Amino acid sequence: TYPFDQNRFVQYKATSLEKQHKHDLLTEPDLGVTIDLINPDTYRIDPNVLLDPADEKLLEEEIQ
Amino acid sequence: VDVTRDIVSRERVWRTRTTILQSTGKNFSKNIFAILQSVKARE
Amino acid sequence: QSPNNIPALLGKACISFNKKDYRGALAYYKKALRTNPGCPAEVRLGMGHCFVKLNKLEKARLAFSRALELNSKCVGALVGLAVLELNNKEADSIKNGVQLLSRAYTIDPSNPMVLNHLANHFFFKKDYSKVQHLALHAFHNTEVEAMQAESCYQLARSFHVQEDYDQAFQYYYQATQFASSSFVLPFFGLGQMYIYRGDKENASQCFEKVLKAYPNNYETMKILGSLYAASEDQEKRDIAKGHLKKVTEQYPDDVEAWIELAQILEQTDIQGALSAYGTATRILQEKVQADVPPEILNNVGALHFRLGNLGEAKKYFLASLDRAKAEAEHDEHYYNAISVTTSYNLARLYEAMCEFHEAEKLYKNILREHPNYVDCYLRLGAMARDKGNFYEASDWFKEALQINQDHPDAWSLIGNLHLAKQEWGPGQKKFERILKQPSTQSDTYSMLALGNVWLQTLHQPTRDREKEKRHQDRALAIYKQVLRNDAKNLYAANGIGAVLAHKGYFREARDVFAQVREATADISDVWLNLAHIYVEQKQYISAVQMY
């Protein structure tokens, strides 16, 4: 048989298998927002409403 | 001695006695035991 | 009752998100930004996190950007883009390290995300101190399983490269036990940790989920080197074949890949082992011009021994012994013992040359230096057995039992000598009972020898006296026993067919011999026994040709 090194250690490393993983964001289980109908003391629905171009292109689901 | 365990560990046996008798194909014995019982049906 | 404001229905959508229904999340989430109630908590943050899901990344970037424009103090946008650019590390390293991470550390030094990510960065930046400063807090400050699974995993990879493997093993196990379905690096950590402390049984089981995760080049070599496949164990051996032809076409600096290729190929096709050794001979020469270790060269000569390549097998053994001599100082690896078994192989080769003189020389050289060895002690005996039985053949055989009475091979060979004396037929019950101790049992070879010495009793004029009928049924009982313990023995089935042919069932014999005939033609007995049937139908023109 061949006297193999016991490969108890990583030096390649597994970093190809590591940084390919995109890591979840689960800081707050309701997705990082306090869910409240009382803290909206303000509302943009009054004149005037605000809606940035970035905000319209996020109001679409998939239209590209 | 240390030579004994020293050699018998590092070598390998791929060819023993017993699997010479056993066939490299798959020849089961149900067919064999079926005709074994069939000759007993003549008995 | 009152759909008059949106966080009433946005709390539906976080439930939908946590049920992995990002469509049902974003359906209510479209209704957020059309209205946008008073929200410093950035409805756009969860927008981007849903856009993190299912690779809607460009929308995620824009959502986190507008989150930063409404409030740069908020953490979720910056860490979202931090993970978003965790894809490219060699590209845009610094902005990930400082802007995407250290700013999140600045605005919150208690955020276990940014602590975990600076931890694994410090690992890759080889800062092994402050990773253990802040990975503990990254463990304690979080309470969800996958995050503290990653915390334990990162402390485990920290102490693993720091070789504090006892603690890091516990971290790997906790990392697996907290959240398992997340990702498989903690499973890899435990499996390679089982290489520590000899715990490798669970290494195979844990690494199976790595293949259940997804196959890679990485996860071949762990199961290949961790080869519980010894022989006739396909659950580790077929997967070994699959990994070996997962890496043979590859080359992630393959060196030993051919060694553990051929290391299972010796049971299988020998030519595959030859080819593996062929490029394995080369592969030890280009990285450095390094002579091939003699264990390889001895084994390739051993391959050619069962091939026709007997001469270069001899050359392999010669250069093997030279390379072992070139292992001048390697009594750790015990090149001397390797030379001992190499010389054993070479003497067995000289027997194939029928150079029994030099075979005697090599054998007595080994026995004069390692007399504890038995196989050389009896191959010498076998050589004189070729001359005859009552030589020192029989006495080397008996002293092989004297040095090792536990030895079943030599003990079988004792009665094999007595096969010559068939007048010592009924006496062979005793000399084939000695190692019918159940430590040696089951011994198929010996019990078939019992069947054979019991069948040579037949063709006598005492069958009508029921004596050979009892002998036929007793051999039948032996053959039933070896039948049940092995369906795939062929000498058994030859025995059954022989005894029933002696029972006069020759139409009932050519069929059972036909089975072993396709099983292997290279049994000299079945050629005879088939033609006996043929001449029993007077089928000479089918018989003498096969004779």
XYZ file of C-alpha atoms in Angstrom:
654
model
C 0.000 0.000 0.000
C 1.053 3.575 -0.215
C 1.927 5.454 2.985
C -0.557 8.274 2.560
C -0.421 11.467 4.558
C -3.392 11.780 6.856
C -5.059 14.850 5.355
C -6.310 16.311 8.625
C -5.867 19.857 7.350
C -6.823 22.249 4.554
C -4.298 24.227 2.508
C -5.730 24.130 -1.047
C -8.034 25.615 0.428
C -11.724 24.874 0.037
C -11.958 28.604 -0.824
C -13.319 27.807 -4.281
C -16.173 26.026 -2.505
C -16.268 28.783 0.112
C -16.562 32.164 -1.609
C -18.936 30.649 -4.160
C -21.440 30.550 -1.302
C -23.543 33.699 -1.103
C -24.501 34.248 2.504
C -28.036 34.795 3.769
C -29.235 37.858 5.659
C -31.353 36.645 8.583
C -30.583 39.346 11.163
C -34.262 39.952 11.864
C -36.694 37.159 10.919
C -39.270 39.623 9.572
C -36.511 40.832 7.190
C -34.782 43.672 8.982
C -37.780 45.974 9.425
C -39.816 46.771 12.500
C -43.346 45.979 11.352
C -45.566 48.702 12.788
C -48.649 50.695 11.859
C -48.058 53.174 14.700
C -44.556 54.496 13.958
C -45.719 55.808 10.493
C -46.643 59.125 12.081
C -45.641 60.547 8.687
C -46.965 59.633 5.241
C -45.769 60.660 1.787
C -49.306 60.105 0.428
C -50.026 63.736 1.308
C -49.059 66.351 -1.302
C -46.577 65.802 -2.493
C -45.851 62.116 -3.063
C -42.228 61.117 -3.646
C -41.084 58.382 -6.023
C -37.456 58.278 -7.238
C -36.518 56.720 -10.611
C -34.808 54.004 -8.588
C -38.107 53.675 -6.725
C -40.121 53.142 -9.917
C -37.653 50.563 -11.228
C -38.089 48.763 -7.898
C -41.896 48.969 -8.166
C -41.649 46.430 -10.977
C -41.382 42.698 -10.368
C -39.537 41.702 -13.549
C -39.777 44.087 -16.505
C -36.028 44.857 -16.704
C 8.548 -10.041 15.572
C 8.239 -6.491 14.257
C 9.080 -7.736 10.748
C 5.952 -9.934 10.698
C 3.397 -7.222 11.484
C 5.687 -4.842 9.565
C 5.191 -6.755 6.308
C 1.680 -8.216 6.641
C 0.242 -4.769 7.273
C 1.809 -2.998 4.298
C 1.163 -5.682 1.681
C -2.233 -6.543 0.223
C -3.947 -9.764 -0.812
C -6.146 -9.480 -3.864
C -6.023 -13.186 -4.640
C -6.988 -15.656 -1.911
C -8.023 -19.302 -1.939
C -11.720 -19.009 -1.286
C -12.768 -16.709 -4.115
C -11.084 -18.994 -6.602
C -13.833 -21.483 -5.773
C -16.424 -18.728 -6.010
C -17.086 -17.773 -9.619
C -16.360 -14.333 -11.053
C -19.793 -14.239 -12.682
C -23.072 -14.494 -10.812
C -24.137 -18.132 -10.829
C -26.780 -18.505 -8.163
C -27.846 -21.882 -6.839
C -31.631 -21.612 -6.866
C -31.605 -23.180 -10.346
C -29.173 -25.666 -8.847
C -31.297 -26.242 -5.777
C -34.455 -26.344 -7.915
C -33.103 -29.263 -9.901
C -31.797 -30.671 -6.617
C -35.387 -30.720 -5.433
C -36.566 -31.910 -8.840
C -34.442 -35.045 -8.682
C -35.927 -35.482 -5.204
C -39.316 -35.302 -6.926
C -38.223 -38.359 -8.887
C -37.327 -39.778 -5.470
C -61.659 45.097 8.188
C -59.270 47.959 7.284
C -56.665 47.718 4.474
C -55.854 51.379 5.083
C -52.092 51.063 5.610
C -49.392 48.790 4.230
C -47.411 47.304 7.215
C -50.656 45.488 8.010
C -50.065 43.541 4.778
C -46.273 43.744 4.849
C -46.319 41.519 7.920
C -48.064 39.005 5.706
C -45.205 39.252 3.260
C -42.476 38.606 5.818
C -44.412 35.473 6.800
C -44.563 34.587 3.092
C -40.821 35.255 2.796
C -40.081 33.005 5.770
C -42.219 30.344 4.096
C -39.724 30.729 1.184
C -42.533 32.273 -0.898
C -40.651 35.271 -2.244
C -43.374 35.758 -4.858
C -45.995 36.044 -2.128
C -43.633 38.350 -0.280
C -43.030 40.658 -3.241
C -46.733 40.689 -4.123
C -47.445 42.620 -0.923
C -44.057 44.334 -1.161
C -45.099 46.060 -4.386
C -47.805 47.702 -2.270
C -45.186 49.111 0.109
C -43.271 51.454 -2.198
C -46.372 52.725 -4.000
C -47.500 54.062 -0.629
C -44.335 54.244 1.536
C -45.708 55.054 5.005
C -43.516 56.656 7.628
C -40.635 54.238 7.597
C -37.133 55.107 8.777
C -36.794 51.303 9.039
C -36.493 51.177 5.231
C -39.134 49.027 3.560
C -36.549 49.072 0.741
C -34.220 47.018 2.963
C -36.538 44.014 2.903
C -37.133 44.841 -0.757
C -33.448 44.285 -1.448
C -33.339 41.161 0.707
C -36.140 39.666 -1.369
C -34.100 40.809 -4.354
C -31.153 39.031 -2.734
C -33.314 35.922 -3.110
C -33.453 34.316 -6.579
C -30.572 36.495 -7.871
C -32.393 39.795 -8.364
C -29.095 41.364 -7.353
C -29.214 44.556 -9.430
C -32.541 45.399 -7.796
C -31.027 44.440 -4.436
C -28.157 46.881 -5.020
C -30.556 49.677 -5.929
C -32.751 48.973 -2.902
C -29.788 48.961 -0.520
C -28.502 52.119 -2.213
C -31.735 54.060 -1.664
C -31.794 52.615 1.845
C -28.384 54.216 2.364
C -29.594 57.497 0.863
C -32.569 57.621 3.220
C -30.288 56.576 6.088
C -26.635 55.628 5.736
C -26.642 54.770 9.453
C -28.724 51.643 8.786
C -26.779 48.381 8.832
C -28.777 46.032 6.584
C -28.028 47.800 3.300
C -24.256 47.894 3.810
C -24.035 44.279 4.961
C -26.321 43.264 2.098
C -23.939 44.826 -0.401
C -21.046 43.359 1.598
C -22.340 39.843 1.001
C -23.322 40.902 -2.531
C -19.667 41.665 -3.257
C -18.488 38.641 -1.283
C -18.768 36.930 -4.678
C -15.696 38.801 -5.955
C -12.812 38.653 -3.489
C -9.813 38.860 -5.833
C -11.779 41.638 -7.553
C -12.682 44.527 -5.220
C -11.056 43.192 -2.069
C -10.529 46.482 -0.237
C -14.034 47.914 -0.635
C -15.436 44.652 0.708
C -12.990 44.610 3.616
C -13.266 48.228 4.775
C -16.171 50.051 3.116
C -18.576 47.115 2.976
C -17.506 45.570 6.244
C -15.528 47.837 8.581
C -18.086 50.607 8.150
C -20.758 48.144 9.278
C -18.478 47.245 12.186
C -18.197 50.967 12.903
C -21.929 51.681 12.865
C -22.460 48.495 14.883
C -19.606 46.479 16.422
C -22.132 43.962 17.790
C -23.523 42.784 14.447
C -22.814 39.042 14.136
C -23.019 39.219 10.320
C -20.159 41.701 10.016
C -18.305 39.936 12.833
C -18.589 36.627 10.934
C -17.459 38.224 7.703
C -14.467 40.037 9.159
C -13.757 36.721 10.880
C -13.569 34.768 7.637
C -11.707 37.656 6.000
C -9.127 37.675 8.825
C -8.895 33.943 8.258
C -8.093 34.535 4.593
C -6.029 37.597 5.514
C -4.354 35.184 7.985
C -5.237 37.341 10.990
C -5.857 34.425 13.313
C -5.999 36.518 16.492
C -8.915 38.971 16.208
C -11.020 36.359 14.433
C -11.082 34.694 17.852
C -11.657 38.046 19.511
C -14.854 38.632 17.617
C -16.094 35.180 16.580
C -17.006 34.436 20.192
C -19.136 37.577 20.272
C -20.409 36.648 16.801
C -21.470 33.388 18.444
C -23.019 34.874 21.587
C -24.652 37.947 20.010
C -26.570 35.777 17.562
C -29.188 33.269 18.635
C -30.321 31.798 15.316
C -28.779 28.417 14.525
C -27.163 28.976 11.108
C -25.378 32.104 12.288
C -24.007 30.412 15.382
C -23.389 27.369 13.195
C -21.196 29.605 11.054
C -19.640 31.080 14.193
C -18.682 27.629 15.473
C -17.555 26.687 11.968
C -15.305 29.735 11.733
C -13.822 29.176 15.177
C -13.313 25.583 14.062
C -11.465 26.619 10.900
C -9.440 29.017 13.056
C -8.302 26.337 15.492
C -7.970 23.831 12.651
C -5.241 25.837 10.939
C -3.998 26.480 14.481
C -4.170 22.686 14.995
C -6.260 23.011 18.174
C -8.350 20.234 16.730
C -9.979 18.885 19.902
C -11.946 22.078 20.500
C -12.470 22.821 16.804
C -13.929 19.316 16.420
C -16.598 20.235 18.962
C -17.209 23.469 17.055
C -17.612 21.514 13.819
C -20.116 19.174 15.448
C -22.095 22.063 16.924
C -21.983 23.807 13.540
C -23.501 20.736 11.916
C -26.011 20.262 14.709
C -27.334 23.833 14.762
C -28.476 24.252 11.154
C -27.626 21.338 8.892
C -29.604 21.959 5.685
C -27.970 25.384 5.249
C -24.604 24.430 3.755
C -22.068 21.635 3.878
C -18.745 23.154 5.019
C -19.404 22.128 8.666
C -19.993 18.592 7.384
C -16.663 18.728 5.581
C -15.053 20.050 8.749
C -16.368 17.172 10.841
C -15.428 14.617 8.203
C -11.842 15.817 7.945
C -11.829 16.118 11.731
C -12.674 12.445 11.926
C -9.328 11.842 10.253
C -8.025 13.221 13.515
C -8.299 10.774 16.425
C -9.110 7.867 14.104
C -12.805 8.739 13.995
C -13.063 8.077 10.284
C -16.203 5.910 10.345
C -18.348 8.995 10.738
C -16.170 10.779 8.171
C -17.640 8.631 5.397
C -21.192 9.101 6.673
C -20.777 12.861 7.018
C -19.050 13.212 3.646
C -21.911 11.365 1.972
C -24.003 14.494 2.510
C -21.329 16.468 0.658
C -22.128 14.360 -2.385
C -25.776 14.741 -1.436
C -25.070 18.473 -1.433
C -23.327 18.534 -4.847
C -20.300 16.706 -6.292
C -16.923 18.407 -6.614
C -13.305 17.530 -7.250
C -12.593 18.235 -3.536
C -15.017 15.653 -2.221
C -13.547 12.863 -4.283
C -10.155 12.689 -2.560
C -11.599 12.615 0.959
C -13.538 9.425 0.223
C -10.723 8.097 -1.936
C -8.014 8.476 0.704
C -10.520 7.579 3.421
C -10.933 4.244 1.703
C -12.877 1.874 3.893
C -13.201 0.022 0.608
C -10.878 -2.888 1.269
C -12.359 -5.763 -0.778
C -15.842 -6.906 -1.847
C -17.244 -3.738 -0.266
C -18.831 -1.836 -3.136
C -20.627 0.706 -0.929
C -17.181 2.277 -0.514
C -15.730 0.797 -3.688
C -18.175 1.729 -6.446
C -18.204 5.285 -5.122
C -14.414 5.037 -5.158
C -14.609 4.088 -8.839
C -16.893 7.045 -9.492
C -14.605 9.504 -7.725
C -11.557 8.035 -9.411
C -13.093 8.574 -12.813
C -14.208 11.919 -11.457
C -10.554 12.895 -10.993
C -8.714 10.867 -13.631
C -9.898 13.141 -16.426
C -9.163 16.068 -14.150
C -5.801 17.311 -12.946
C -5.882 19.453 -9.788
C -2.180 18.589 -9.590
C -3.047 14.901 -9.576
C -0.156 12.956 -8.079
C -1.447 10.003 -6.088
C -4.787 10.006 -7.938
C -3.454 7.190 -10.098
C -2.105 5.422 -7.000
C -5.524 5.153 -5.399
C -6.913 4.475 -8.858
C -4.867 1.325 -9.211
C -5.125 0.561 -5.486
C -8.659 -0.681 -6.105
C -7.904 -1.811 -9.647
C -5.872 -4.783 -8.433
C -9.084 -6.637 -7.682
C -10.422 -5.448 -11.043
C -8.862 -5.327 -14.502
C -5.096 -5.315 -14.172
C -4.493 -3.233 -17.310
C -6.185 -0.251 -15.685
C -3.727 -0.577 -12.820
C -0.914 -0.792 -15.376
C -2.050 2.419 -17.049
C -2.402 4.168 -13.695
C 1.142 3.163 -12.744
C 2.305 4.193 -16.214
C 1.433 7.856 -15.894
C 2.125 7.632 -12.163
C 5.713 6.787 -13.060
C 5.805 9.953 -15.135
C 4.043 12.220 -12.653
C 6.850 11.823 -10.094
C 9.364 13.209 -12.583
C 8.142 16.630 -13.724
C 7.550 18.492 -10.449
C 10.972 17.180 -9.432
C 13.031 14.459 -11.047
C 12.234 12.057 -8.211
C 12.826 8.326 -8.458
C 9.672 6.238 -8.166
C 9.365 4.659 -4.705
C 9.965 0.918 -4.908
C 6.531 -0.019 -3.557
C 5.062 1.162 -6.870
C 7.650 -0.656 -8.936
C 7.288 -3.888 -6.978
C 3.538 -3.740 -7.424
C 3.738 -3.138 -11.174
C 6.080 -6.107 -11.445
C 3.491 -7.994 -9.403
C 0.902 -7.005 -11.989
C 3.067 -8.191 -14.879
C 3.556 -11.470 -13.008
C -0.052 -12.374 -13.742
C 0.462 -10.954 -17.215
C 2.800 -12.188 -19.911
C 5.315 -9.462 -19.093
C 7.450 -11.700 -16.910
C 10.844 -10.353 -17.978
C 10.178 -6.689 -17.328
C 8.393 -7.788 -14.170
C 11.791 -9.165 -13.179
C 13.396 -5.861 -14.179
C 10.810 -4.099 -12.013
C 11.745 -6.237 -9.036
C 15.458 -5.623 -9.605
C 15.040 -1.858 -9.814
C 12.625 -2.075 -6.875
C 15.343 -3.645 -4.758
C 17.765 -0.987 -5.986
C 15.370 1.827 -5.083
C 14.876 0.244 -1.672
C 18.660 0.282 -1.442
C 18.318 3.917 -2.492
C 16.028 4.201 0.555
C 19.251 4.045 2.543
C 17.911 5.496 5.808
C 14.206 4.614 5.795
C 13.732 2.005 8.510
C 10.697 4.061 9.478
C 9.185 3.077 6.114
C 11.121 -0.210 6.502
C 12.560 -0.513 3.026
C 14.252 -3.637 4.394
C 10.846 -5.261 4.968
C 9.745 -4.013 1.566
C 12.852 -5.660 0.125
C 11.872 -8.820 1.995
C 8.483 -9.030 0.331
C 10.000 -7.834 -2.958
C 12.484 -10.686 -2.833
C 9.572 -12.984 -2.035
C 7.858 -11.797 -5.203
C 11.080 -12.162 -7.182
C 11.609 -15.703 -5.928
C 8.025 -16.465 -6.906
C 8.987 -15.019 -10.288
C 12.077 -17.224 -10.501
C 9.693 -20.095 -9.920
C 7.792 -18.825 -12.976
C 11.124 -18.805 -14.856
C 11.504 -22.265 -13.310
C 14.768 -20.853 -11.946
C 14.269 -22.846 -8.785
C 17.973 -22.539 -7.993
C 17.818 -18.769 -7.560
C 14.371 -19.183 -6.016
C 16.032 -21.355 -3.366
C 18.697 -18.678 -2.968
C 16.276 -15.802 -2.377
C 14.070 -17.910 -0.120
C 16.932 -19.044 2.092
C 18.270 -15.490 2.182
C 14.970 -14.322 3.599
C 14.501 -17.243 5.974
C 18.047 -16.944 7.293
C 17.206 -13.315 8.098
C 13.515 -13.551 8.852
C 12.750 -17.155 9.852
C 9.415 -16.048 11.339
C 8.023 -15.831 7.800
C 5.966 -18.774 6.594
C 5.136 -18.284 2.918
C 8.777 -18.521 1.886
C 9.022 -21.495 4.256
C 6.339 -23.354 2.313
C 6.988 -22.235 -1.259
C 10.310 -23.949 -0.720
C 8.220 -26.856 0.509
C 6.005 -26.557 -2.561
C 9.101 -26.614 -4.764
C 10.213 -29.910 -3.249
C 6.607 -31.102 -3.494
C 7.053 -30.733 -7.241
C 9.881 -33.190 -6.697
C 7.766 -35.207 -4.253
C 5.834 -35.651 -1.012
C 8.071 -37.269 1.654
C 10.856 -34.775 1.007
C 11.629 -31.865 3.305
C 8.656 -30.540 1.366
C 6.439 -32.332 3.894
C 8.675 -31.198 6.726
C 8.849 -27.522 5.874
C 5.093 -27.892 5.634
C 4.862 -29.465 9.087
C 7.290 -26.981 10.646
C 5.250 -24.193 9.099
C 2.530 -25.543 11.363
C 5.127 -25.799 14.128
C 5.961 -22.118 13.769
C 2.264 -21.322 13.171
C -0.362 -23.985 13.891
C -3.003 -21.291 13.484
C -2.050 -20.993 9.813
C -4.932 -22.349 7.706
C -3.131 -22.174 4.369
C -0.237 -24.363 5.478
C -2.588 -26.580 7.468
C -4.645 -27.151 4.323
C -1.432 -27.875 2.449
C -0.678 -30.588 5.025
C -3.687 -32.569 3.893
C -2.970 -31.542 0.322
C 0.168 -33.626 0.694
C -2.033 -36.459 1.904
C -4.129 -36.238 -1.231
C -1.250 -38.071 -2.914
C -1.762 -40.992 -0.525
C -5.340 -41.881 -1.326
C -5.002 -45.014 0.814
C -4.881 -42.290 3.464
C -8.434 -41.475 2.451
C -10.447 -42.170 5.611
C -7.517 -40.929 7.680
C -7.971 -37.463 6.219
C -10.951 -36.844 8.496
C -8.475 -36.250 11.330
C -5.924 -34.214 9.360
C -8.762 -32.095 8.015
C -10.403 -31.796 11.429
C -7.504 -30.069 13.238
C -8.490 -26.582 12.097
C -12.185 -27.282 12.026
C -11.948 -25.097 15.063
C -14.525 -22.369 14.416
C -11.933 -19.602 14.398
C -10.853 -21.082 11.063
C -14.413 -21.999 10.102
C -15.869 -21.298 7.713
C -13.217 -22.820 5.429
C -14.881 -23.500 2.084
C -11.623 -24.828 0.654
C -11.201 -27.474 3.339
C -14.830 -28.539 3.409
C -14.803 -28.973 -0.346
C -11.668 -31.029 0.253
C -13.788 -33.132 2.620
C -16.340 -33.501 -0.154
C -13.629 -34.524 -2.610
C -12.014 -37.105 -0.343
C -15.541 -38.272 0.280
C -16.304 -38.613 -3.434
C -13.149 -40.558 -4.284
C -14.753 -43.247 -2.110
C -17.281 -43.810 -4.901
C -17.405 -46.128 -7.932
C -17.077 -49.226 -5.767
C -19.121 -52.461 -5.874
C -20.614 -51.635 -2.436
C -23.228 -49.089 -3.574
C -25.862 -51.844 -3.691
C -24.870 -52.435 -0.043
C -26.201 -48.878 0.591
C -22.704 -47.841 1.692
C -21.885 -45.698 -1.310
C -25.499 -44.543 -1.340
C -24.899 -43.176 2.155
C -21.606 -41.773 0.900
C -23.386 -40.108 -2.023
C -25.951 -38.572 0.291
C -23.240 -37.496 2.747
C -21.307 -35.770 -0.027
C -24.663 -34.326 -1.088
C -25.084 -32.999 2.454
C -21.634 -31.384 2.321
C -22.563 -29.930 -1.042
C -25.864 -28.598 0.267
C -23.958 -26.991 3.138
C -21.500 -25.296 0.795
C -24.462 -24.504 -1.467
C -26.241 -22.539 1.249
C -23.137 -20.775 2.497
C -22.029 -19.978 -1.076
C -24.271 -20.005 -4.129
C -21.439 -18.861 -6.399
C -18.847 -21.557 -5.719
C -18.327 -23.625 -8.837
C -16.319 -26.581 -7.537
C -19.335 -27.234 -5.332
C -21.712 -27.464 -8.312
C -19.161 -29.662 -10.037
C -19.379 -31.886 -6.970
C -23.182 -31.984 -7.000
C -23.224 -32.852 -10.681
C -20.556 -35.502 -10.168
C -22.393 -37.211 -7.325
C -25.711 -37.185 -9.183
C -23.948 -38.508 -12.275
C -22.648 -41.295 -10.058
C -26.322 -41.576 -9.110
C -26.979 -42.221 -12.793
C -28.606 -38.892 -13.670
C -26.560 -37.873 -16.680
C -29.349 -36.051 -18.455
C -29.620 -34.273 -15.106
C -25.884 -33.547 -15.121
C -25.013 -31.768 -18.359
C -27.251 -28.877 -17.335
C -25.591 -28.301 -13.961
C -22.183 -28.606 -15.585
C -23.333 -26.220 -18.298
C -23.735 -23.559 -15.604
C -20.141 -23.782 -14.414
C -19.204 -24.066 -18.082
C -20.316 -20.512 -18.782
C -19.107 -19.488 -15.321
C -15.534 -20.350 -16.268
C -14.309 -22.726 -18.942
C -10.869 -22.864 -17.303
C -11.645 -25.740 -14.958
C -9.966 -28.893 -16.197
C -12.461 -31.180 -14.453
C -15.647 -30.068 -16.185
C -14.179 -30.804 -19.622
C -13.884 -34.464 -18.609
C -17.212 -34.691 -16.826
C -19.152 -33.280 -19.771
C -17.584 -35.735 -22.197
C -18.405 -38.599 -19.843
C -22.033 -37.635 -20.346
C -21.480 -37.367 -24.105
C -20.076 -40.878 -24.396
C -22.922 -41.945 -22.139
C -25.189 -40.814 -24.979
C -22.417 -42.231 -27.224
C -21.828 -38.658 -28.465
C -18.189 -39.294 -29.313
C -18.104 -36.611 -32.011
C -19.009 -34.142 -29.272
C -16.662 -35.658 -26.696
C -13.146 -36.383 -27.971
C -12.718 -32.878 -29.376
C -13.368 -31.481 -25.933
C -10.979 -34.083 -24.543
